[PDB]
DNA sequence: ACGACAGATAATTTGTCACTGTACACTACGCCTTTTGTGGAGATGTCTAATATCTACGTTTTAACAGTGGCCTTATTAAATGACTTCTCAACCTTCAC
């Protein structure tokens, strides 16, 4: 059943901004910059954005805040 | 792309040790109520054998006397006594004697 996040900590919401940014629409054409422009705001490589994103659509906002 | 090798790295628990909040300060099984089955007199009710009493049952004994039954010989003549009965209870005249 539904599990909702609360008590967001700062740096949960810094993969929110990121989130919020990549959730306009994009193709392989511009996944990959707009990817990357999001990355140098992370400062991390892109492979965890990639697992970020990931585990965003794997588990939502409960996804990209780390469980114990 | 993603995820997939060996290893980094943010947790996670294990273990130290300075610090502090607290009890020890004697102070619950005890006060009080109710039920309750067991128990001790103690007034009262229960109801008999029996040793008379208390007359009668009537039943013996007495004597009094009543009735039955046996016996008792009968004659004559005399006497005494007491009685009974019957009969009787004249009257004038003549004759011879003094």
């Not at 008590?7 to 919020?20: N, T, Y």
């Not at 990357?36 to 588990?59: C, F, G, M, P």
């Amino acid at each position: 059943k539904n599990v909702i996040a609360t008590q967001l900590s700062e740096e949960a919401q810094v993969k929110l901004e990121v989130i919020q940014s990549l959730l306009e629409p994009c193709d392989r054409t511009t996944y990959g910059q707009k990817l990357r422009e999001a990355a140098e705001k992370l400062n991390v490589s892109l492979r965890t954005v990639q697992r970020l994103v990931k585990n965003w659509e794997q588990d939502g906002l409960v996804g990209l805040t780390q469980t114990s």
